[PDB]
Design an enzyme around this catalytic site. Structure first.
Site, PDB file in Angstrom:
ATOM      1  N   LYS A 152       0.864  -1.163   0.000  1.00 44.74           N
ATOM      2  CA  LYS A 152       0.000   0.000   0.000  1.00 44.74           C
ATOM      3  C   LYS A 152       0.898   1.210   0.000  1.00 44.74           C
ATOM      4  O   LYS A 152       1.836   1.281   0.837  1.00 44.74           O
ATOM      5  CB  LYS A 152      -0.855   0.018   1.256  1.00 44.74           C
ATOM      6  CG  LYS A 152      -1.778  -1.218   1.396  1.00 44.74           C
ATOM      7  CD  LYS A 152      -2.968  -1.171   0.465  1.00 44.74           C
ATOM      8  CE  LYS A 152      -3.711  -2.522   0.378  1.00 44.74           C
ATOM      9  NZ  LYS A 152      -4.096  -2.847  -1.048  1.00 44.74           N
ATOM     10  N   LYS A 178       2.896  -9.758  -3.151  1.00 41.18           N
ATOM     11  CA  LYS A 178       1.848  -9.810  -4.166  1.00 41.18           C
ATOM     12  C   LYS A 178       1.688  -8.471  -4.851  1.00 41.18           C
ATOM     13  O   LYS A 178       1.523  -7.443  -4.235  1.00 41.18           O
ATOM     14  CB  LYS A 178       0.518 -10.320  -3.593  1.00 41.18           C
ATOM     15  CG  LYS A 178      -0.648 -10.353  -4.591  1.00 41.18           C
ATOM     16  CD  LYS A 178      -1.893 -11.092  -4.054  1.00 41.18           C
ATOM     17  CE  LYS A 178      -3.227 -10.503  -4.610  1.00 41.18           C
ATOM     18  NZ  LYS A 178      -3.197  -9.222  -5.483  1.00 41.18           N
ATOM     19  N   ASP A 180      -0.555  -5.860  -6.849  1.00 48.23           N
ATOM     20  CA  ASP A 180      -1.952  -5.475  -7.052  1.00 48.23           C
ATOM     21  C   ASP A 180      -2.456  -5.888  -8.434  1.00 48.23           C
ATOM     22  O   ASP A 180      -1.696  -5.890  -9.411  1.00 48.23           O
ATOM     23  CB  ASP A 180      -2.066  -3.987  -6.937  1.00 48.23           C
ATOM     24  CG  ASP A 180      -3.488  -3.540  -6.754  1.00 48.23           C
ATOM     25  OD1 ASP A 180      -4.098  -3.115  -7.749  1.00 48.23           O
ATOM     26  OD2 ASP A 180      -4.054  -3.566  -5.635  1.00 48.23           O
ATOM     27  N   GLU A 181      -3.736  -6.192  -8.545  1.00 54.09           N
ATOM     28  CA  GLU A 181      -4.305  -6.541  -9.866  1.00 54.09           C
ATOM     29  C   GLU A 181      -4.092  -5.493 -10.996  1.00 54.09           C
ATOM     30  O   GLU A 181      -4.022  -5.850 -12.179  1.00 54.09           O
ATOM     31  CB  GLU A 181      -5.797  -6.863  -9.725  1.00 54.09           C
ATOM     32  CG  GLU A 181      -6.642  -5.637  -9.434  1.00 54.09           C
ATOM     33  CD  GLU A 181      -6.737  -5.283  -7.965  1.00 54.09           C
ATOM     34  OE1 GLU A 181      -7.328  -4.209  -7.653  1.00 54.09           O
ATOM     35  OE2 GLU A 181      -6.186  -6.059  -7.123  1.00 54.09           O
ATOM     36  N   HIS A 270      -6.141 -14.179  -9.676  1.00 55.38           N
ATOM     37  CA  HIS A 270      -6.870 -13.044  -9.140  1.00 55.38           C
ATOM     38  C   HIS A 270      -8.183 -12.971  -9.918  1.00 55.38           C
ATOM     39  O   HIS A 270      -8.262 -13.217 -11.151  1.00 55.38           O
ATOM     40  CB  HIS A 270      -6.086 -11.728  -9.264  1.00 55.38           C
ATOM     41  CG  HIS A 270      -6.536 -10.667  -8.303  1.00 55.38           C
ATOM     42  ND1 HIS A 270      -7.572  -9.795  -8.582  1.00 55.38           N
ATOM     43  CD2 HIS A 270      -6.104 -10.351  -7.048  1.00 55.38           C
ATOM     44  CE1 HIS A 270      -7.771  -8.997  -7.532  1.00 55.38           C
ATOM     45  NE2 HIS A 270      -6.876  -9.296  -6.599  1.00 55.38           N
ATOM     46  N   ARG A 271      -9.219 -12.622  -9.199  1.00 56.48           N
ATOM     47  CA  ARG A 271     -10.564 -12.725  -9.747  1.00 56.48           C
ATOM     48  C   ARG A 271     -11.198 -11.360  -9.986  1.00 56.48           C
ATOM     49  O   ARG A 271     -12.414 -11.263 -10.046  1.00 56.48           O
ATOM     50  CB  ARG A 271     -11.431 -13.557  -8.810  1.00 56.48           C
ATOM     51  CG  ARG A 271     -11.640 -12.986  -7.413  1.00 56.48           C
ATOM     52  CD  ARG A 271     -12.699 -13.729  -6.651  1.00 56.48           C
ATOM     53  NE  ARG A 271     -12.963 -13.141  -5.325  1.00 56.48           N
ATOM     54  CZ  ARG A 271     -13.958 -13.506  -4.529  1.00 56.48           C
ATOM     55  NH1 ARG A 271     -14.803 -14.456  -4.919  1.00 56.48           N
ATOM     56  NH2 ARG A 271     -14.128 -12.906  -3.358  1.00 56.48           N
ATOM     57  N   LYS A 310     -14.947  -6.530  10.536  1.00 58.12           N
ATOM     58  CA  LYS A 310     -15.368  -5.395   9.684  1.00 58.12           C
ATOM     59  C   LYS A 310     -15.900  -5.881   8.319  1.00 58.12           C
ATOM     60  O   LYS A 310     -17.020  -5.544   7.931  1.00 58.12           O
ATOM     61  CB  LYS A 310     -14.217  -4.385   9.468  1.00 58.12           C
ATOM     62  CG  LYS A 310     -14.624  -3.100   8.703  1.00 58.12           C
ATOM     63  CD  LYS A 310     -13.541  -2.004   8.754  1.00 58.12           C
ATOM     64  CE  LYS A 310     -12.414  -2.245   7.729  1.00 58.12           C
ATOM     65  NZ  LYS A 310     -12.552  -1.423   6.481  1.00 58.12           N
ATOM     66  N   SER A 340      -8.522 -12.767   1.730  1.00 57.62           N
ATOM     67  CA  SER A 340      -8.154 -11.361   1.659  1.00 57.62           C
ATOM     68  C   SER A 340      -9.356 -10.535   2.037  1.00 57.62           C
ATOM     69  O   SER A 340     -10.482 -10.941   1.781  1.00 57.62           O
ATOM     70  CB  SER A 340      -7.762 -11.023   0.236  1.00 57.62           C
ATOM     71  OG  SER A 340      -6.985  -9.844   0.204  1.00 57.62           O
ATOM     72  N   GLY A 341      -9.143  -9.387   2.672  1.00 61.48           N
ATOM     73  CA  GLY A 341     -10.193  -8.401   2.832  1.00 61.48           C
ATOM     74  C   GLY A 341     -10.193  -7.884   4.235  1.00 61.48           C
ATOM     75  O   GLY A 341     -10.984  -8.337   5.046  1.00 61.48           O
ATOM     76  N   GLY A 342      -9.311  -6.937   4.517  1.00 62.39           N
ATOM     77  CA  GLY A 342      -9.279  -6.306   5.827  1.00 62.39           C
ATOM     78  C   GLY A 342      -8.793  -7.256   6.905  1.00 62.39           C
ATOM     79  O   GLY A 342      -9.214  -7.168   8.035  1.00 62.39           O
ATOM     80  N   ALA A 363      -2.864 -10.014   3.788  1.00 63.76           N
ATOM     81  CA  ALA A 363      -3.129  -9.047   4.882  1.00 63.76           C
ATOM     82  C   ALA A 363      -2.233  -7.819   4.771  1.00 63.76           C
ATOM     83  O   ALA A 363      -1.653  -7.362   5.760  1.00 63.76           O
ATOM     84  CB  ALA A 363      -2.945  -9.714   6.223  1.00 63.76           C
ATOM     85  N   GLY A 364      -2.134  -7.263   3.571  1.00 62.86           N
ATOM     86  CA  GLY A 364      -1.244  -6.132   3.342  1.00 62.86           C
ATOM     87  C   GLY A 364      -1.637  -4.856   4.104  1.00 62.86           C
ATOM     88  O   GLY A 364      -0.788  -4.197   4.706  1.00 62.86           O
TER      89      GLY A 364
END
Lengths: 410, 424, 107
Positions: A152, A178, A180-181, A270-271, A310, A340-342, A363-364
């Site tokens: 990030k 990783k 980013d897409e 990646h989706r 969250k 992935s996701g928060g 968990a970036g």
């Protein structure tokens, strides 16, 4: 010829027929007709015409063998003979069972729920080259989940800035850098410059830590470019490539599976864009079908979603997808779900209690956010994972890992 | 006595309704409905996730991060939601890669919990983005030139039924359709290569029939042959078509995907092939008016890469999709757009000879008209059906009444009588 | 030699290669006589025109001017030195069109 010729609710599909399950809502026609229309459109269509009917067409008809009320609509299951299919070509399968059917005016909504390929279809697909066990072996990680981290911000890094952050993340304990897409190749971060540098940093960190480190490097592009980029990663000693499989699409994915077969690369799928068609519960293609196709061709890792104080998607749906991805399925090796996701260290026990140890955990955001900086955040993430695996309360552990303590405050 | 800087970036920082984008920024228009957040915050989330994202970190920001932020510059209520227009600096893009563009603007954004629904409506590439796309190799004028057809719409037919044909049986139906006047034989989107109809065996045979019909009629005939497959296979099949004398391939572009399409456009540049794009699977994401990607945006991408013709929908009783939406798409496909050549809209969905006057009045002569059932269903057989379709189009263009034309055209006369016998 | 401070100015006027130097050069493939032969023009000078303006032509607009120039008697169409390949006039698209026009005018 009419749609009810494709309907026979007493038919018993042979073990050499492919089954597709659909949810649908009729629009001004009977449920039976609507299901017959689906079967027709996904097989030989209509005839009636003074012209000689081709000899293989009767043997190619799909058949609705199950139809029942379901919520505000209906589920049909439809059986497909393999004469309808170009074997080995997932692309042609989806052209039949996931194509024009979604545009039919006689349906309000159509959702492809799952498909079930028979042995004689499935045997022309290799599945993952490595899968869970292949990756566990080349990463040297026998039991815990693997860790991944997208930096990030997600865009804007020069080759050198990206080298520096990568060194912190890997050195602090992350297994997998990783991309980013959206992060492919830019004037200030050309893909081949990035490869040359980043694999040298990777090798340095391996030597200093004694742990294997890898890079989910984004090769997404026009296929010829993705192939060239995959070749550069292999030549530099990489054992992973990342492909945005929905954006790139099925034709490129199948070919890339042949490329990675020759070069010894695992595929991280990646989706991005999936939710354009997998989110609406009444219409589109389910994430399960998507995953199943992706597993058959042979991605080794794929994103599926998480459960999270969250964030959090539907637990049941995610657990259904993950169970499929890890399930025994003939010769097709199992696939790691990517969570992935928060995600952050405090969430690790629960993520693990609910979804198990065969995960790649991205968990970036939490790692990048640590009050002591990214390297400390990575340790906090490995440190709370080890504690979950061992059954230790995170507040006990925290007594000997101040990088995890500092993380728990927040 | 060190003072450190925690860098914070948040969704609303991506919103500035007084911002005036430069001519060299890319603009994307979205419809959305927020879920549990303000319309501003929702819009910010879109701009954020399609650009640099948000974050909290001690780590030094990469220098280009601040120059890579998307900005929401327009935000207004629209029906039960909102439209945002968002501006993107070209530093966020790998130029020439539409794959990468769509990963950014049409990717993770659709899955955001804080949006109830999200639809990408349109995008506007600046000159410096667009100039790295060739657009169609032929377009309307190129196809008209090699087909030798200067003014009238072109005709196409997919045989019925759509699967099961042997090479020999397909040759026989093709001879009929072409001989009776159809311009373009068309494979079904499902019909690729089978044991009973192997792609290479089909190319060898059908182009021989094609050439025979050309010799017999004095008219150019072509074949929208389905090369869809894993990319390497599609490439080999395109080479076989060109080798046999073909000037067209058909690709199921949504099922195949953008990555394969962009490469196939380089392949076809080398082989002199026009691309017919079939859009099977589009409606999984283009149909919901609240969520997904519009057919207009898909069409714009496909034109920029360079399909020469693409299915857009029609205005019939028996297939009428929205007139307004369809006309918008066709207008775009045919509009002047820098160096990008115009693309034929392909009209399909229950067309038959009696609809040709209305179809042409409403959508013009620059069309490929696919009339499957109407042709295959003619009471006197597919050859006669093809003639009926060609005669109805000649009449529509000449401003001649269909019943007046039917006096010198038995095929058109029978076709008209049948509609009446099959109409409630 | 051109940058030496001990010289205020320096100009290379001519050079004369001996036979053993010059023999490792082919010179022109065609020259005057090769060109006259493939152009079919035996005595008169050849003619050439660069279109005006020097830039901004599309392939089709370039095809139309070339047709005029060649058809009226020009031997050689000539691109301007700055006119290579552009989004609105890609070199390979130009080659395909202009040589068809060329062959038409020859006929």
């Amino acid at each position: 010829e009419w749609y009810l010729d494709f309907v026979d609710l007493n038919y018993e599909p042979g073990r050499d027929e492919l089954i597709v399950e659909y949810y649908f809502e009729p629009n001004g026609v009977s449920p039976e007709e609507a299901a017959g229309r689906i079967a027709s459109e996904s097989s030989i269509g209509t005839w009636t015409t003074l012209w000689k009917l081709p000899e293989m067409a009767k043997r190619s008809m799909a058949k609705v063998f199950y139809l029942e009320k379901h919520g505000e609509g209906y589920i049909a299951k439809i059986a497909y003979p393999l004469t309808l299919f170009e074997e080995g070509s997932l692309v042609q399968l989806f052209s039949a069972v996931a194509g024009n059917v979604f545009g039919m005016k006689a349906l309000k909504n159509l959702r492809l729920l799952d498909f079930h390929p028979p042995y004689e279809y499935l045997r022309h697909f290799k599945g993952p080259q490595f899968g869970v066990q292949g990756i566990r072996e080349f990463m040297g990680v026998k039991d815990r989940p693997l860790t991944a981290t997208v930096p990030k911000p997600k865009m804007g890094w020069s080759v050198e800035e990206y080298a520096e952050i990568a060194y912190e993340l890997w050195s602090g304990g992350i297994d997998l850098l990783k991309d980013d897409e959206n992060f492919t190749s830019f004037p200030f971060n050309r893909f081949e410059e990035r490869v040359r540098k980043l694999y040298r940093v990777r090798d340095r960190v391996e030597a200093e830590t004694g742990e294997t480190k890898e890079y989910l490097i984004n090769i997404t592009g026009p296929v010829n470019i993705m192939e060239k980029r995959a070749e550069m990663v292999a030549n530099e000693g990489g054992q992973y490539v990342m492909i945005d499989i929905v954006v790139a699409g099925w034709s490129a994915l199948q070919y890339m599976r042949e490329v990675t077969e020759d070069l010894g690369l695992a595929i991280h799928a990646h989706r991005a864009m999936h939710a354009a068609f997998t989110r609406n519960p009444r219409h589109g293609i389910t994430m399960l079908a998507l995953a199943k196709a992706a597993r058959m061709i042979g991605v080794d890792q794929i994103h599926t979603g998480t459960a999270v104080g969250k964030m959090a998607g539907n637990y049941e749906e995610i657990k259904r997808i993950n169970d499929f991805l890890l399930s025994k399925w003939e010769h097709i090796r199992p696939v790691f779900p990517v969570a992935s996701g928060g995600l952050h260290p405090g969430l690790m026990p629960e993520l693990i209690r609910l979804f198990g140890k065969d995960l790649v955990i991205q968990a970036g955001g939490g790692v990048m956010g640590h009050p002591d900086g990214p390297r400390a955040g990575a340790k906090a993430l490995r440190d709370a994972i080890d504690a979950a695996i061992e059954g230790v309360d995170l507040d006990e552990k925290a007594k000997s890992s101040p990088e995890l303590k500092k993380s728990l405050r927040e």
